[PDB]
Amino acid sequence: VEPVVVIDGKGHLVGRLASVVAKQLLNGQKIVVVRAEELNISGEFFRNKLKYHDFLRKATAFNKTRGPFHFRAPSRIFYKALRGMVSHKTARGKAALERLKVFEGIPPPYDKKKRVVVPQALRVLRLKPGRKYTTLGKLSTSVGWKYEDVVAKLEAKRKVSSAEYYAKKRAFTKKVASANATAAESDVAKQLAALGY
Amino acid sequence: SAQKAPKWYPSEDVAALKKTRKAARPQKLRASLVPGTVLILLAGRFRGKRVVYLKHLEDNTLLISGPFKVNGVPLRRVNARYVIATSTKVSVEGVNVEKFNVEYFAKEEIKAERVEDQKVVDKALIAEIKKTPLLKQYLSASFSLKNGDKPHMLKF
Amino acid sequence: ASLPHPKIVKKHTKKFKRHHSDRYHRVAENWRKQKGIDSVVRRRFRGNISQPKIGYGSNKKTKFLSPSGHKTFLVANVKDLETLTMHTKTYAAEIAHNISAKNRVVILARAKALGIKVTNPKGRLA
Amino acid sequence: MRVRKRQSRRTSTKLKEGIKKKASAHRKKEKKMAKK
Amino acid sequence: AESHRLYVKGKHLSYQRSKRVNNPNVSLIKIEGVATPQDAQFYLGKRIAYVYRASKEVRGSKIRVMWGKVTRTHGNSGVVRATFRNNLPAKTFGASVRIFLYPSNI
RNA sequence: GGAAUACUGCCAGCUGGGACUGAGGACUGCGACGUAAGUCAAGGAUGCUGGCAUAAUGGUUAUAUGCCGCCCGUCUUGAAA
RNA sequence: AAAUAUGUAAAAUGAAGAGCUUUUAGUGGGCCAUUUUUGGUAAGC
RNA sequence: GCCCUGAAAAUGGAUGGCGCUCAAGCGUGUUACCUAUACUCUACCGUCAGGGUUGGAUGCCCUGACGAGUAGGCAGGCGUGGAGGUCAGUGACGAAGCCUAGACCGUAAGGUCGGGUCGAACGGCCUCUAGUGCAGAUCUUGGUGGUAGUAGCAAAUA
RNA sequence: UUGGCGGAAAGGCCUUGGGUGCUUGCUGGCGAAUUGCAAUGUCAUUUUGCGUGGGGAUAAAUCAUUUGUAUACGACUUAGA
After folding, report:
1. Which of C4, C74, C90 lies at the smallest CB-CB distance from B3?
2. Cβ–Cβ of A54/D3 closer than 8 Å?
3. Signal peptide span per the entry (chain B)?
4. Helix or strand run (H / E) with residue A92
5. Which structural domain range is residue C47 located in?
6. How far apart are CA A178 and CA A167, in angstroms?
7. Are C97 and C74 in contact (CB under 8 A)?
8. How far C121 CA sits from the closest chain B CA (Å)?
9. What is the CATH number of the domain that holds E98?
10. Which of A82, A78, A79 is nearest to A19 (CA)?
11. How many CA atoms lie within 13 A of E16 on its CB side?
12. Number of domains comprising chain C
């Protein structure tokens, strides 16, 4: 219902998230996916790496600059999975893809917005315990992505700042909770509680 | 001749219609529409206003009033399908609305008969309204849907 | 003011144009049926042009009627016009293309006197 | 890490219909040899 | 107040269709807050408007309206079928529509 | 020992919401309700109300968008190429 | 002795067209599969 | 029973793709839902059929059922040159023809009207008659494109 | 206006002080009608111009000429008040 929906991609299964995002974009919702380096794929790391290497060997023989472009970054791997689920060669598909942004980490301005999750795509809710799974950052770094460390350092800095913000918010929440607990005995409090509030 | 005349012509005798078996029986309103109920206008220049339902007219319209002094909605008629009937009611025992009808609202400045009738009806409506708390403020306020409001589940 | 009629419904307002008349200038749009044994248009494959057929025929009550509800009768002079003297609710007069302006004014005056609708009273008007 | 070619699971119409004919012939010969 | 809305928001999803043929005479509409056909039953017969803007002013407005109604429910998830006086343009797949509370049975 | 409920079926039981359609054109028929007069949902839509009266509806045309649509004819063979 | 699978002759179900005599046109290849059957191959057949 | 092995080459590629792992795989059960020119109901067109019609009968009224199609068969229509009759038909106050982002009728062959251009003839109806309707024939004659301002005008000393 | 903080795409967050409004925390008093029983019934934000009054700043590139670290033509690279 929001004008823009920001999905924290951490702990999501790539294909189920891609299916959800594709339907939302086609239905007209603006979506920003952050932390694409923390997406999961079910199956062993060696298996998913083998699948990527098969993708890598696919190329146009007489001119490689024409063949499939193998993007290494996690955001681009997710974008590929999504474009496969959109009819991207039509004007409607292009307009749908114009409604999507995908990022590694959480850069500005989304680092101060609310992030949501997609429960039907969450690894902890979908995969059975004991099943091996792959992380997109490791897969990307093994296939040639070169910014894993930079993103990790930036995310550590963001987490430090976010922890400070949350400490201040926790203090203010405690103060407001006390101010409301001192008002639980009033006539307005009794009337509101009778009405359910 | 540019065109040869037809040897046969359709008749110009305008035949009458057959006798129609379609009687006009009185409209049956839904149960929630009883006089005195507060109803929310859904369209018109007064959309979102909360008014009081007085009586059911012969052209199947509903006679409503704000009352005019509470929210600025005069004595009017409205269509029943363009309102929501809420559960709040006010007594209309002391209100005399037997002089209002289609000929009263015939259109064919603002008439003094309508002004004075509005004052007279507003007097008794105000007297009855001042019994339950916050009802005058409720009638002054306008209605709208909020974020997350689901009309199929809202109780009106 | 014609005789009352049902609302006129046209089943197919679009013109039936010949196959590949758009593609070739030498192929005119006048309808022709394709007669090749392998014609996909003849065999009625999906996504091709529609072809004329009797099912498209219009209701017999509102056939030949103008929107005003009259059938068109071409008149060349006042004697032709006066044939419609009694059938003014069923027939409207259309002046023939080759009538001169000075005869058109006479025909229009006579039609107005007789209460006959004229489909083209603006032809050759000064 | 030279990943080799993978066999296609996309079945061709020619192979599918040939297999159908092979199965029919197999059943007919099964009946005849059961008779014999 | 800051809200004056007397309608429910909806999205124009697509035409009624099979896999390979569409019917532009029926539009599928996703109404906000409606997740089952049983709840979708509330909105049957309600008026629906597509409100758009045009550069050229026409009879004292630059705002144009396509009117229609909700006809029946569609599927298992609360999507409805709607019919408009003129069929909705196809570029409006994913655009917003207004479902009004009238004609009202409450 | 006494019930209830489920399930399956029946009602010439009652009642609410939605959609598409309104063909026909004096009367004639079969019925229903009434002591009668007559009335009726009974051989197919009527009643009340509003705005506009023109590009507003609509037509035509150019484009855009969604889905669909292989280049015609001949000639061969079941058939296709 | 239930009937897998054909004939003759007389109850079921359906049917508004039937019989005869003169006449006229086009046609005169096959491919694929099921079933039964006879003969075969390493296997197809 | 499911899983691995149970051999397979050579441009890069395919359960249709994406992707999917308490599946979006496999076996099975119960429901809901989606949509064909199919089924039901209605309107309309045509064909056929069955009833009625002494007061445009080649018609008119009522009712029912049907509608794929090559060769071929049968029927009803549309258009063209010329001929007999007729409309005491159209016309220099503008015939014919041509152009038209305009209008109307017909399922269609086609027909009609407005506007422009133009300058001398031409139509409706009932009949007669034929050198009577074109996308093709490596068709005939004439006209005209792309290719393209491209190939080329570099022998003969200057 | 004070004082900070944020470089991942910071372009935003927080705070200081005074001024200026509103306040539905509570009680009152006037107005609304006629848009005629509905008609988005017009309230958002992109850009481009024209007019006013408040300020600000006073260039280059290309051809032509020229070089050969370049060169089929373009292009490239030098120089010239």
Report:
1. C74
2. yes
3. none
4. helix A91-97
5. 6-126
6. 17
7. no
8. 17
9. 2.40.10.190
10. A82
11. 16
12. 1
CA–CA dist C58, B115 (Å, integer):
59
Contact predicate C75/B2, CB 8 Å = yes
Instruction: Report d(CA D20, CA D18) in Å as an integer.
Output: 5
D7-34 b/e with 16+ CB inside 10 Å = b? eeeeeeeeeeeeeeeeeeeeeeeeeeee
Q: Locate all alpha helices (DSSP H) within A28-73, ordered by sequence.
A: 45-57
Look at phi and psi of residue A144 and say left if phi exceeds 0, alpha if psi is from -120 to 50, else beta: left
The DSSP letter of residue E11 is E
Q: Residue E87 carries which DSSP code?
A: P
State which approach was used to obtain the coordinates. cryo-EM
D29 alpha-carbon distance from chain centroid? 16
Inter-chain touch A27–E95, beta carbons under 8 Å: no
Query: Could you tell me the domains of chain A?
Result: 1-147 (3.90.1180.10), 148-197 (1.20.5.4280)
Q: Which of C63, C90, C117, C119 to mutate to test the interface with B (most CBs of B within 10 A)?
A: C90
Coil, helix or strand at residue A49: helix
- Measured between alpha carbons, how far is A16 from B95 in angstroms, rounded to an integer? 64
Beta-carbon contacts of residue A30 (< 8 Å; ≥ 6 apart):
A3, A4, A5, A99, A100
* Domain carrying residue E87: 1-106
Q: Is the CB of residue B14 less than 8 Å away from at least one CB of chain C? A: yes
Tell me, in Å, the resolution of the deposited structure.
2.8
Q: Which residues pair with C54 in a beta bridge?
A: none
Residues 75-94 of E with CB under 7 A from strand H: 75-76
The structure tokens listed for C92 are 């409207």
C1 part of a folded domain: no
- The strand pairing partners of E22, in sequence order, are E17
- Find out whether A18 and A81 touch, Cβ atoms under 8 Å: yes
Rg (CA), chain D: 17
Backbone φ and ψ of B43, nearest 5°: -155, -175
- A and E: touch, per 3+ CB pairs < 8 A? yes
Integer Cα distance of E102 and C25 in angstroms = 55
Backbone torsions φ then ψ of E9, nearest 5 degrees: -80, 145
The three-class DSSP label of residue E43 is: helix
Closest nucleotide to the alpha carbon of C66, via C1': H104
Structure tokens at B141: 């306020």
CB contact under 8 A, C86 and B9: yes
Cβ <8 Å between A53 and D6: no
